[PDB]
Amino acid sequence: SNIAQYKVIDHAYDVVIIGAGGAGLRAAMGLGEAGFKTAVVTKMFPTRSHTTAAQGGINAALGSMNPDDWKWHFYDTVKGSDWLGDQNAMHYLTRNAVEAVTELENFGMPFSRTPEGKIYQRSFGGQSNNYGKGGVAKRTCCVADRTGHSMLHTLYGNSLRCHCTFFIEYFALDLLMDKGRCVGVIALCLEDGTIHRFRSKRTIVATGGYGRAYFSCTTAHMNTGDGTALATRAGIALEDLEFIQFHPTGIYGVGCLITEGSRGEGGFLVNSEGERFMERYAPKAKDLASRDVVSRAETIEIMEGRGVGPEKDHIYLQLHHLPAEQLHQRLPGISETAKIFAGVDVTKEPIPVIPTVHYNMGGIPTNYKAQVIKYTKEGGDKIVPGLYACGECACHSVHGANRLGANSLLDAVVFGRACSINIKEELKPDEKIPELPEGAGEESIANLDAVRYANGDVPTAELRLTMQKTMQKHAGVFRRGDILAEGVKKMMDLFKELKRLKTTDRSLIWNSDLTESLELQNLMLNATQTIVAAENRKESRGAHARDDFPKREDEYDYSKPIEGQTKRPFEKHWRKHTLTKQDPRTGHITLDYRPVIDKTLDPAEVDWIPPIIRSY
Template sequence: MSAYKITEHKYDMVVVGAGGAGLRATFGLAQKGLQTVCLTKVFPTRSHTVAAQGGISAALGNMGEDDWRYHFYDTIKGSDWLGDQDAIEYMCREAIPAIIELEHYGVPFSRTEDGKIYQRPFGGMTTKYGEGPSAQRTCAAADRTGHAMLHTLYQQSLAHNARFMIEYFALDLIFDEEGVCRGVLALDMAEGSLHLFRAHGVVLATGGYGRAYFSATSAHTCTGDGGGLVMRAGLPVQDMEFVQFHPTGIYGAGCLITEGVRGEGGILRNSNGERFMERYAPHYKDLASRDVVSRSMTVEIREGRGVGEHKDHILLDLTHLGPEVINEKLPGIAESAHIFAGVDVTKQPIPVLPTVHYNMGGIPTNFYGEVVRKQGDDPDAVVPGLYAIGEAACVSVHGANR
């Protein structure tokens, strides 16, 4: 018998985490008629997806020629050829109807003049399997895409009567004698009380572990909680060595400056005022893949061409874009740069530095989202009743780089 009072709850499904992946799972399960509860450390619309700026990619072809197969090729190449190609094919093909689905749910995407979803270029996006011009593939809601998605999915979850337990911290997974995951033990952080959530299945959508690093674009809630849950249960994690550094975190703060800034025409410059990416990636320049740009910036700094008193960062210049473009397409960036760097982006460049941004590793799953582990001769034995999605999971569609 426990020495602590534990309050029990019974649901069909428990979702841990209320970011983009967690809310989509919560909404989807509730829509199918399952009694669903979502446990979250913070109010759902404060989850880290709210900080996603530049957009979400799908080969809609609204801004020029594109094809999901080009997206497929770019993703495999961007993963340093280490991504699971079956999972990548599925993701890139299904991204198109997924975006249309989000639009129908109410995500207020920015629009082209003829009313289509606006798409901007991001690094590493090509056409003709790398032989053609850059693709404009990233569907955007100005520079607050995550904010728009998160609020829409939360509203849809409420509309389908999903239950939210806010400021609850998941402590341990619960398994039965057959090894089936049957629920979660959680702490009510407001009261300090323990709660046992019994269910037929558990979905882990706890995000990444960026805050394991000193400087990260991640919110302070991104502490790898899902990985901790599965490791305490004796289950493995995968590819934890693959950590993406985003080229443009605000120097000294780590706050993200979206790749969309460079997609709209922003330029990286060294202490000589040189657009140095022309030397490292002559074709794609500032829109080379994130790992290429981050390494190039690091080389510039190490060779003495950094800026500032200690020559330890780089400048991101968007002054040439003009106030009209900035205010229409990058209003959040202008605000972030003013708050965290004291910069008026219409007149001054933003000081930036490569910063931990995304964790490719996580809880190993198949592309159904089922958690897997090695069992006997089967390297992909399913852990019944346990699922992982989003950044917490590792399928792996990202390989060594996203």
């Protein structure tokens, strides 16, 4: 629109997949081999996706190390979610873990082995045997210290055998909607500056997370929440965005992950008093408690003068008591990262670490079939025709208020796979590749042009930087209504500064000043939504810790016996999902709340798990 002109190219596909991480590739494998003419749109070569950075492992009750059941895994996931998790999706997840991880081994994923030639497994945070009652589990399957790397390369390799067609370094700008239906996607081709509209019967969103909304994170530069943003722009409300996982052990200076697997293998955290303080904060699980708990324990230590180093403002991960053949065998990757980025030799010195933004349990709301949904009190859950979402961009929700470690590679694969299963069942040759309405994509092009030639006075790098810092400050590990309200006002001001936007590069070819600006827009949508949702939730649940409201607010008080209590009405408690609708021009956000699904897929296969106090 306006100041320049754009080549526009149309395509027709059965399904379009926006993302080639673990989730998008697994769906692409499924759909490709099922016959569908399937297109994979990704803004980077699939192998560079963030999935490839995953380290510690992937969960499945294989029993390679000891007897195990998938229902123990399930329980651990429900408890992990601090009962904001939908128990149907979590049931689906845990039910399929063993088949899913096994397929990966069959595709050639080179798992670490036991002396029996089975897939080696390790312990991880927040996992137990026997519905909480037994010991720490060994359920977490790994390729040493590089499980996601290995998985992504295995999935990419096998995708090449399933006749997909890759639009690599294509940057999606919007879904194409026609009256409540998604009929494709529009994207900019980085290579030659052209503009492509893909028409499709189904569209799968698998775009990853939005860690770069914060100043410090483990995530990749590409984690800018474009998928969630796409959905906002299509008038779809996002779910549970306030629930942001801080990983206990990002390296102090640089944000680089150090796997929780290093604690699973026998490492532990230490304060300036030389104390294994997680013995105090979580007597049973200790250093293998859930991530929300461990990260908070870490932060208190820091706040309470027991921080480590020159400024006493981080903490030590200690592995040097572990045999050096174990470190090399089980954690070669982080041994290397730790030396490169901290000068630290893990056999002799401990690693400086600090909690760090890592994973988004929030995202696009779906049902357990991974079909995207809109909700009203009156109408309930209404599916958005043609549109599926999976992986980190999605909220199924299999993680609720706190994601269990090694459950995300899992949820990518399982629900990536589910997308293909469910589409091959409900899509008939009956249906034809829908036609685009007149003008489809013009808005997205107009926006592109505006950002391309934007000649205001705030360069995007600095606007981004203030957002990231605002977010680090007002929406961190512990939150307070006054600090949150303050943060919100600043965020909506920054969103107003989008109009004063300055870019410099005016080329159409490989203009990363432009795509990074587009990315900022998407980030801002996510970030503003995140904070007003967090501001409004007056409870402490999983990763959302409010200092002014330290209680988990449920329909009953599950800390006392139930009988004789009267259930609080929906509007009065907080055991419910947050839904944020945002107007993308103005920035105005409205909230609504949707009930948590408590039933399983089949009470005969497994019981539901009623809330209880969450300890470790």
